[PDB]
Write a protein that binds this ligand. Structure first.
Ligand SMILES: [Zn+2]
Lengths: 60, 150, 144, 49
């Protein structure tokens, strides 16, 4: 009953960085993006998303 | 006739703005000799080499040619009027950008704070009633200081 | 995407960052030199930012000259500086890390692209709204 | 409206793209009219209504 209970536990991944604060919940429960390798005229940005309460903002 | 906006002699609390500082500009922290009012200000250290704990004289005037209007900008270098708070060692032209206070407590407005900008140069003045006659305005004030390294 | 398409870039963007520096100081001679570069100007020389020990102008003063004189854009310095969410609040020496302009006059703040365009909260979008394309195009050509 | 609005946005995000930024417009009036927190705020509320 333990081992079959364990089979949900984590699921299959992870991430989280816990660096940027979220102004909607003070907790730094945030995720970060590495994208825009080249793109156009828009500068390559680091995008940060807060898992809880759904917040996303940019390095810029 | 020379309706000065402010005048006081100030003491340097700090010349090191949070350590990191900057090259041609540095932020001083000062307190008035009443020791009831304090001040933080960005300055050109290169033209005015401050020392820590120094005793400074500070004056503020929203006008020069006495009390009459002049809030214009013909940097008329050729003025000859002795109505110049010029004898002070250091002069700046600027605006008040922010005012702090607290009137929600009932009349309070207790420990009024004024923030001022001279060409981007930030300033903070704190005081119960020293700023009771001033408020945030477009660029008009002239700030004059002397008594460097007294 | 209800956003501006214009964008000042590269050399121009870098020198603007350089130009917003606190250590930027100008001479009267160069101010006249800078004034002639203007695509448009009131014909009225501005007051020195400094009078003593010697008369001087700041780059923020002069950038604000470029700016049209009755419109403002705030809240997005969008630079790494200062800190994320509560450090700059750490007293309010509002500082050079955050952008603020009033009555066409830049108070503080190193510039970014999110300020400069192709994004929400950009100066470019509001100038387009207030000043219109014609005034904004002449300002833009002038600044460049 | 506040009670209705909870139905419309179950995500609870109040940040939406909309026309006419009244805040900037209202702010501009303040920049123009020169209203400040140390000046009285003479107003007729029904006129507002
Ligand atoms: Zn959050």
């Amino acid at each position: 009953k333990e081992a079959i209970r364990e089979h949900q536990m984590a699921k299959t991944g992870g991430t989280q960085t816990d660096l940027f604060t979220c102004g909607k919940c003070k907790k730094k429960n945030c995720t970060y993006t590495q994208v825009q390798t080249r793109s156009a005229d828009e500068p390559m940005t680091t995008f940060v998303v807060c898992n809880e309460c759904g917040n996303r903002w940019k390095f810029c | 006739m020379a309706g000065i906006l402010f005048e006081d002699i100030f003491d340097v609390k700090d010349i090191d703005p949070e350590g990191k500082k900057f090259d041609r500009v540095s932020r001083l922290h000062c307190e008035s000799e009443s020791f009831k009012m304090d001040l933080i200000l960005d300055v050109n250290i290169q033209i005015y080499p401050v020392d820590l704990g120094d005793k400074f004289r500070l004056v503020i005037a929203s006008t020069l040619y006495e009390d009459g209007t002049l809030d214009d900008g013909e940097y008329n270098p050729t003025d000859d009027r002795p109505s110049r708070a010029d004898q002070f060692e250091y002069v700046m032209y600027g605006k008040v950008y922010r005012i702090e206070g607290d009137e929600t407590s009932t009349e309070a407005a207790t420990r009024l704070s004024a923030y001022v900008s001279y060409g981007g140069l930030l300033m903070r003045l704190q005081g119960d009633a020293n700023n009771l006659h001033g408020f945030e305005v477009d660029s008009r004030v002239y700030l004059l200081m002397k008594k460097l390294a007294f | 995407s209800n956003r501006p398409v214009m964008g000042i870039v590269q050399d121009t963007l870098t020198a603007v960052r350089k130009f917003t520096k606190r250590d930027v100081f100008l001479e009267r001679g160069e101010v006249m030199n800078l004034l002639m570069f203007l695509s448009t100007w009131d014909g009225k020389v501005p007051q020195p930012a400094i009078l003593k020990p010697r008369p001087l102008w700041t780059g923020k003063q002069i950038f604000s000259l470029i700016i049209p004189g009755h419109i403002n854009c705030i809240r997005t310095h969008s630079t790494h500086p200062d800190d994320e969410d509560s450090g700059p609040y750490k007293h309010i020496s509002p500082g050079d890390t955050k952008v603020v302009v009033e009555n066409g006059e830049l108070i503080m703040g190193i510039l970014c692209k999110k300020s400069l365009g192709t994004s929400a909260g950009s100066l470019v979008h509001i100038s387009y709204l207030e000043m219109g394309h014609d005034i904004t195009r002449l300002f833009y050509s002038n600044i460049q | 409206d506040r009670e209705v609005l909870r139905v419309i946005f179950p995500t609870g995000d109040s940040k939406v793209v909309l026309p006419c930024n009244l805040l900037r417009m209202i702010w501009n009036a303040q920049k123009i009219f020169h209203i400040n927190p140390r000046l009285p705020s003479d107003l007729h509320p029904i006129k507002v209504v």
